[PDB]
Swiss-Prot record:
Family in the record: Belongs to the biopterin-dependent aromatic amino acid hydroxylase family.
Gene: TPH1
Pathway assignment: Aromatic compound metabolism; serotonin biosynthesis; serotonin from L-tryptophan: step 1/2
A GO CC term assigned to this protein in UniProt: neuron projection
Gene Ontology MF terms: iron ion binding; tryptophan 5-monooxygenase activity
Keywords, ordered alphabetically: Iron, Metal-binding, Monooxygenase, Oxidoreductase, Phosphoprotein, Serotonin biosynthesis, Ubl conjugation
Gene Ontology BP terms: aromatic amino acid metabolic process; bone remodeling; mammary gland alveolus development; platelet degranulation; positive regulation of fat cell differentiation; regulation of hemostasis; serotonin biosynthetic process
EC number: 1.14.16.4
Catalytic activity: (6R)-L-erythro-5,6,7,8-tetrahydrobiopterin + L-tryptophan + O2 = 5-hydroxy-L-tryptophan + (4aS,6R)-4a-hydroxy-L-erythro-5,6,7,8-tetrahydrobiopterin
Keyword Lipid biosynthesis belongs to the record: no
Residues given in the record as Fe cation binding sites: 169, 174, 214
Residues given in the record as L-tryptophan binding sites: 132, 154, 162, 233, 263
Name of the protein: Tryptophan 5-hydroxylase 1
Length: 290
């Protein structure tokens, strides 16, 4: 039978809180595990997401000096690499978001503002989420041009901590490209193809999403550059991917979907997409076979 899937944007209310990883619960190994203040703050952000319902303006938060400084360091360091490492489509959009949404070393952009900016640009919107959802639920959000986004900030003790993703990853890694029409269309189609799809189908779509939206590379003027959100928000993997150390292959769904998605370590191989339009076309051909 066909598993339950949202039929309208408000139906996301029925899966947005199905958090399987991260969230308010911090493990003993977490940088802020022994920080009482941080623990309560994470519960706060988690509650804002759990209580959120479609149609609500996303609760705005007055970030602390510590959170702003942590964001500043992450933003400062990554921005030093973008000019020479990021794909032109990213470089064209980050400045846009920054101007209209307040991306500054001393100011964390509010999700509601980013959501409204995206709504007018590509129809994409943001929904705050406590933690990571299942691939099926997260992808179902894309079908309605909704990107579930974390709102909390990594612990200040280690601004370069990536094991657990946070709002910096969302704002710097995922958001800019959602302002690009072709990228937004590509993302929505992955979501639409996943609705009510089989487990095997969702797994394959999730993998293609992983090697494009999350860790995709482009080749511009013969130079390898990154567009994957996981690369754009990670200093270490950002450099690793563009070094001759990593294996690189052309994006090809039938093959790319066979690749295992790694966590904790660098990917065994990164895939290069010719353009967002071409990646979209390749996925159309692929989905017709699954
Ligand atoms: C998209 C792919 O399925 C990936 O494994 C997932 N990413 C995310 C997720 N959930 C959230 N909130 N954010 C993500 O980026 N669930 C699953
Ligand atoms: Fe991500």
């Amino acid at each position: 039978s066909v598993p339950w899937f949202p039929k309208k944007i408000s139906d996301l209310d029925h899966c947005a809180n199905r958090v399987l990883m991260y969230g308010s619960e911090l493990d003993a190994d977490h940088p802020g595990f022994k920080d009482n203040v941080y623990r309560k703050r994470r519960k706060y952000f988690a509650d804002l997401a759990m209580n959120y319902k479609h149609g609500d303006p996303i609760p705005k938060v007055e970030f602390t000096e510590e959170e702003i400084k942590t964001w500043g360091t992450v933003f400062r360091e990554l921005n030093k690499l973008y000019p020479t490492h990021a794909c032109r489509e990213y470089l064209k959009n980050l400045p846009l978001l920054s101007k209209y949404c307040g991306y500054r070393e001393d100011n964390i952009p509010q999700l509601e503002d980013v959501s409204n900016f995206l709504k007018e640009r590509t129809g994409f919107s943001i929904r705050p989420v406590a933690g990571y959802l299942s691939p099926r639920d997260f992808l179902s959000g894309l079908a309605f041009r909704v990107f579930h986004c974390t709102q909390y900030v990594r612990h200040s003790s280690d601004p370069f901590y990536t094991p657990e993703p946070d709002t910096c990853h969302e704002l710097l890694g995922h958001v800019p490209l959602l302002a690009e029409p072709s990228f937004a269309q590509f993302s929505q189609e992955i979501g639409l193809a996943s609705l009510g799809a089989s487990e095997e189908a969702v797994q394959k779509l999730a993998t293609c999403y992983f090697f494009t939206v999350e860790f995709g590379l482009c080749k511009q003027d013969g130079q390898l550059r990154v567009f994957g959100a996981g690369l754009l928000s990670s200093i270490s993997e950002l450099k690793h991917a563009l070094s001759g150390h990593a294996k690189v292959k052309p994006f090809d769904p039938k093959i790319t979907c066979k690749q295992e998605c790694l966590i904790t370590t660098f990917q065994d191989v990164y895939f290069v997409s010719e353009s967002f339009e071409d990646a979209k076309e390749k996925m159309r051909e692929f989905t017709k076979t699954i």
